[PDB]
Amino acid sequence: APISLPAGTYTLKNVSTGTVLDLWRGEAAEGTAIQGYKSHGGDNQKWRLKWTGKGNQVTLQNVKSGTYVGTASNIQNSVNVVGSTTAVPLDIVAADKGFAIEAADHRLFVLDLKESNPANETPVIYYNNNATDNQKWKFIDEK
Amino acid sequence: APISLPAGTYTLKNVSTGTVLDLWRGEAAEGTAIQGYKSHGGDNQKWRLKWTGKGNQVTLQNVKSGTYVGTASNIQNSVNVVGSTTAVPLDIVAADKGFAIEAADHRLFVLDLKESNPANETPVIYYNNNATDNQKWKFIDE
Ligand SMILES: CC(=O)N[C@@H]1[C@@H](O)[C@@H](O)[C@@H](CO)O[C@H]1O
Numbered sequence: 001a002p003i004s005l006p007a008g009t010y011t012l013k014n015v016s017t018g019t020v021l022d023l024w025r026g027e028a029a030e031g032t033a034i035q036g037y038k039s040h041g042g043d044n045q046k047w048r049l050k051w052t053g054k055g056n057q058v059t060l061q062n063v064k065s066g067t068y069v070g071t072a073s074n075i076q077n078s079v080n081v082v083g084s085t086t087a088v089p090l091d092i093v094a095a096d097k098g099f100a101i102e103a104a105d106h107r108l109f110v111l112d113l114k115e116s117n118p119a120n121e122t123p124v125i126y127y128n129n130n131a132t133d134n135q136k137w138k139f140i141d142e143k
Numbered sequence: 144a145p146i147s148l149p150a151g152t153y154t155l156k157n158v159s160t161g162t163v164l165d166l167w168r169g170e171a172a173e174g175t176a177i178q179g180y181k182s183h184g185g186d187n188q189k190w191r192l193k194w195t196g197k198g199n200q201v202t203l204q205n206v207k208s209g210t211y212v213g214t215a216s217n218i219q220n221s222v223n224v225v226g227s228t229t230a231v232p233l234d235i236v237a238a239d240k241g242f243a244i245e246a247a248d249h250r251l252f253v254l255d256l257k258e259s260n261p262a263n264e265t266p267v268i269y270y271n272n273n274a275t276d277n278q279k280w281k282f283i284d285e
């Protein structure tokens with residue numbers, strides 16, 4: 001009424017665990033692990049959603065580090081999601097709960113909280129989209 | 144606040160024109176036109192959103208007719224979107240304004256308000272996703 005997902009800063013909360021998308025210590029170094037972690041409201045747990053101007057593609061950028069949701073190597077199953085100066089372009093797709101986050105140039109793969117594990121520092125990885133709950137993210141807007 | 148697009152009944156308003164997704168007289172016959180039309184709040188301008196259980200795919204069902212966003216022939220450019228007993232599976236993709244509505248098994252093609260034309264009874268068609276504003280839809284929950 002209307003429902004929109006505007007460009008802005010988001011807390012990203014895993015549907016399965018209630019844990020949030022977390023950049024390891026908020027560090028800017030290339031390859032810094034992106035993981036599930038207990039929500040604490042810190043900037044390393046905030047992400048800027050922005051459209052690139054190519055189709056409906058977006059990027060996600062860590063507020064603390066300034067680095068982007070990226071990849072540890074060539075995107076395929078079980079590849080780590082990592083903070084990177086090179087953003088992996090994403091598509092944000094409406095799911096039965098929250099949204100799926102697909103790699104826009106590798107659409108078979110989505111951001112995946114590994115094995116629905118609620119423990120801190122559980123890896124987020126690229127994985128085949130099976131539309132399981134651990135592959136869905138609630139977008140919580142910061143106003 | 145947690146932005147969700149829940150299964151529910153929706154008005155879908157084209158970003159470019161401001162006209163809404165409209166099933167011609169809410170008629171249930173196969174092949175009935177789906178089009179842009181000025182918003183009057185009637186049930187033929189309301190759509191049920193539901194996940195099919197395959198991936199993140201959904202369907203859109205007209206409240207008035209009970210028929211679905213569908214097609215009368217295989218999806219390519221300028222193929223018309225029509226009301227049908229057989230739903231075309233869809234993907235709802237977040238756009239810079241509103242949402243794009245892709246054909247789930249033909250992702251290059253999205254619901255498109257022809258020529259960004261705000262005239263009543265402008266046809267909605269399947270078209271090449273260019274991410275133009277006539278290919279984006281605002282979801283108004285009721
Ligand atoms: C407030 C803050 O930055 N806490 C982070 C935490 O979120 C997590 O990244 C952890 C490493 O797993 O390091 C901590 O310093």
Ligand SMILES: CC(=O)N[C@@H]1[C@@H](O)[C@@H](O)[C@@H](CO)O[C@H]1O
Nearest residue numbers: 165166167168169180183185264
């Ligand atoms: C109030 C109402 O239902 N108006 C409908 C309109 O939405 C549209 O479908 C038109 C056919 O183009 O028929 C009208 O009867």
Ligand SMILES: CC(=O)N[C@@H]1[C@@H](O)[C@@H](O)[C@@H](CO)O[C@H]1O
Nearest residue numbers: 221255256257258259270275277
């Ligand atoms: C015949 C046809 O498909 N018409 C397209 C329309 O779909 C739309 O994308 C528009 C841009 O507003 O360009 C038109 O030429």
